[PDB]
Amino acid sequence: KIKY
Amino acid sequence: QGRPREIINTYTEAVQTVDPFKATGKPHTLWVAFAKFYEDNGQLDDARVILEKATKVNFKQVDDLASVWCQCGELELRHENYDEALRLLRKATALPARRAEYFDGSEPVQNRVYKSLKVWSMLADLEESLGTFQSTKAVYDRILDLRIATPQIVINYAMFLEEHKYFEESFKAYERGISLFKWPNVSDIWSTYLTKFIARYGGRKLERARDLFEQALDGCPPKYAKTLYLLYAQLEEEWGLARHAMAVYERATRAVEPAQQYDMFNIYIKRAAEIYGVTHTRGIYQKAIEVLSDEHAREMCLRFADMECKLGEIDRARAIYSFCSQICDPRTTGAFWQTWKDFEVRHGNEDTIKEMLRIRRSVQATYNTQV
Amino acid sequence: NWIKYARFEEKHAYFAHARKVYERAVEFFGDEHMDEHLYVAFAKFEENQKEFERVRVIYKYALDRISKQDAQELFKNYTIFEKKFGDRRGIEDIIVSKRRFQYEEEVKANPHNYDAWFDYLRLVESDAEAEAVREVYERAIANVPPIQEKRHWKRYIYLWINYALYEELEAKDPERTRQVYQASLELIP
Amino acid sequence: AAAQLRQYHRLTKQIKPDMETYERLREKHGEEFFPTSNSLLHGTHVPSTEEIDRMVIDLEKQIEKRDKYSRRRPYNDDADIDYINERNAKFNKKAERFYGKYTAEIKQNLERGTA
């Protein structure tokens, strides 16, 4: 959730 | 070479083929012919070993297997007494019941209707000569197809009617005919068997017969040419009710001629001619003039126009002529204008009132002639 | 979505979770009536597995549907499909064939002319004892005297024929025939 | 209306919804036009990261120039399908016109005349  | 006999030896070379490769049906047909050469070899000697050796090829997935077993069943029909032929044909016919087809190959489905129904038909319920068909043998054939089959649907329903002759076989034939093939392919035979079975089983002039017959065929495509009516319309008119016959005549008139044929038009105009009366012929004249293809509204409006002018007043003849001006493209014609003018002259016009009819008809023809 | 999951699960073999998911999904989605929702899945799994208990339970749950049995032709064609498949023939399936949608549509015709009363009498030929025949004859007798001259005379013959068949059904010239003679006094012209 | 099923056959479509409809039928015709692949061998290339939708690595090595050409083929196929709109369908009749705008005004005038 911290990238996409 | 030396086929019937030479040394009574080379027949084995005739049965000798080998060379294993990809083939379908050739080793089975040549193996059945080799089983006939075995029939000239002393019959049952070496025949059962050939049938058992050629009976198992891979696992199912072939139409040649059951065709060779069914061929052995035909040779068993050539065997005279049906005791042993019925035992061996009963076990060999009962073997595909456990497993049929669709293991590996180029066939997407099993397709056990043809071969399996052929072996089950050869075992029992041949509908020709051989007997020994149990009351459950028809359900054994319908279960042999296991989904739907209708090459024999007429003969299968005829066999179920021979063993039973009740409404259960008629409803099962209607469901097997509907699920058999879409559209009135086997459903038309289900409709014929529905009318004949409706008369000979469900009773004459039955409401449930018309409810089912009108329910299955309700929307329908146009059958062979077309029938939406004559079976149910004639059956309703012959049932003794003059009320529902007219309702079935109008509802049958809506679906009458999807192809715009004059047949159904004359059948509706004749149905309204033999019943009701004048006003019904006028309503059929307006309805016939409403539906138009090419010559339909012109011919129907002309016939009903002359029939109305010969009976009623001349108002429907003049208005029917004005309606004949907007329809019936000029082409050649010329007879309807002179016949309508003469009919107007016979109505008491003569000098007066005919100047606008002849001048308006010629002015309408010249206006339709363009330049 | 239930038909799609039932089709994919149908091609997936199994069908235990497809039937349990069909009943569970049909139970959670129930609001007013099932109609094309549960009955289509009940007929799909029914005819797929060839189970008479599921067809009888589906026919029982379909009879409890409100809003005039939900969709008329849907439940009628489905009940005729499972009917014709399972048993059909005569007796039960014949009386139910005259009953259900046929007896409801012929039951309430919104009476206007004598044809609807003649259809209600045709469906009332074999129904119950003479009480229902007398109720249909008395209900259709005063239903349509449309006029003095012409028509109603044939409607008066329809009331005299309904009272003659209803009164002559269980007896021969009973007191109901004398009452039919009192109604034959022509209160019309 | 109809949600989904397993089958392939002819249809009608070609209607007003346009973009959404042409993209749905184009993706369905593209997916049905391209069958399955060697992904079983990619089933050897499969290991432990497959599921768990939210992705730890969304790039990796891609595949090769193979998948580049195999990706370029449906682009040229969509270019050829996009090159199909209408035909010339011309003739000498009635009166003359001026370039395109008069022909478009003739089509719109014919659409307004028939109502």
From Swiss-Prot, chain A:
Crosslink feature (Glycyl lysine isopeptide (Lys-Gly) (interchain with G-Cter in SUMO2)) location: 3
Source organism per UniProt: Homo sapiens (Human)
Identification of the protein by name: SNW domain-containing protein 1
Function: Involved in pre-mRNA splicing as component of the spliceosome. As a component of the minor spliceosome, involved in the splicing of U12-type introns in pre-mRNAs. Required for the specific splicing of CDKN1A pre-mRNA; the function probably involves the recruitment of U2AF2 to the mRNA. May recruit PPIL1 to the spliceosome. May be involved in cyclin-D1/CCND1 mRNA stability through the SNARP complex which associates with both the 3'end of the CCND1 gene and its mRNA. Involved in transcriptional regulation. (Microbial infection) Is recruited by HIV-1 Tat to Tat:P-TEFb:TAR RNA complexes and is involved in Tat transcription by recruitment of MYC, MEN1 and TRRAP to the HIV promoter.
Subcellular location: Nucleus
Domain of life (superkingdom): Eukaryota
Family stated for the protein in its record: Belongs to the SNW family.
Signal peptide residue numbers: none
Range covered out of full length: 95 to 98 of 536
Curated annotation (Swiss-Prot), chain B:
Residue stretches of each HAT repeat: 2-40, 131-163, 165-199, 204-238, 276-310, 312-346
Residues bearing PTM N6-acetyllysine: 53
Subcellular location: Nucleus
Highest taxon of source: Eukaryota
Assigned protein family: Belongs to the crooked-neck family.
Role of this protein: Involved in pre-mRNA splicing as component of the spliceosome. Involved in transcription-coupled repair (TCR), transcription and pre-mRNA splicing.
Complex and partners: Associates with RNA polymerase II, the TCR-specific proteins CKN1/CSA and ERCC6/CSB, and XPA. Identified in the spliceosome C complex. Component of the XAB2 complex, a multimeric protein complex composed of XAB2, PRPF19, AQR, ZNF830, ISY1, and PPIE. Identified in a pentameric intron-binding (IB) complex composed of AQR, XAB2, ISY1, ZNF830 and PPIE that is incorporated into the spliceosome as a preassembled complex. The IB complex does not contain PRPF19.
Protein's UniProt name: Pre-mRNA-splicing factor SYF1
Organism: Homo sapiens (Human)
Residues shown, of full length: 368 to 738 of 855
From Swiss-Prot, chain C:
Segments of this protein annotated with the region Mediates interaction with HSP90: 34-189
Record flagged with keyword Metal-binding: no
Keywords linked to the UniProt accession: Acetylation, mRNA processing, mRNA splicing, Nucleus, Phosphoprotein, Repeat, Spliceosome
Expression (tissue specificity): Widely expressed. Highly expressed in testis. Not detected in brain and lung.
Record GO biological process: mRNA splicing, via spliceosome; spliceosomal complex assembly
Sequence ranges of the HAT repeats: 13-48, 50-84, 94-126, 128-162
Residues with Phosphoserine modification: 126
Top-level taxon in the UniProt lineage: Eukaryota
Subcellular location: Nucleus; Nucleus speckle
Annotated Gene Ontology cellular component terms: catalytic step 2 spliceosome; nuclear speck; nucleoplasm; nucleus; post-mRNA release spliceosomal complex; Prp19 complex; spliceosomal complex; U2-type catalytic step 2 spliceosome
Gene Ontology molecular functions: RNA binding
Biological role stated in the UniProt entry: Involved in pre-mRNA splicing process. As a component of the minor spliceosome, involved in the splicing of U12-type introns in pre-mRNAs.
Family, per entry: Belongs to the crooked-neck family.
Quaternary structure and interacting proteins, as annotated: Identified in the spliceosome C complex. Present in a spliceosome complex assembled in vitro containing CRNKL1, HPRP8BP and SNRPB2. Component of the minor spliceosome, which splices U12-type introns. Isoform 2 seems to be predominant in the spliceosome complex. Interacts with PPIL2 (via the PPIase cyclophilin-type domain); they may form a trimeric complex with HSP90.
The protein, known as: Crooked neck-like protein 1
Organism lineage: Eukaryota, Metazoa, Chordata, Craniata, Vertebrata
Residues of the full protein shown: 378 to 566 of 848
From Swiss-Prot, chain D:
Cross-linked sites for Glycyl lysine isopeptide (Lys-Gly) (interchain with G-Cter in SUMO2): 16, 107
Reported tissue expression: Abundantly expressed in the heart, skeletal muscle and kidney. Expressed at lower level other tissues.
Record's subcellular location: Nucleus
Protein function: Involved in pre-mRNA splicing as component of the spliceosome.
Family: Belongs to the SYF2 family.
Subunit-structure text: Identified in the spliceosome C complex. Interacts with CCNDBP1.
Protein name: Pre-mRNA-splicing factor SYF2
Originating organism: Homo sapiens (Human)
Shown chain mapped onto the complete sequence: 128 to 242 of 243
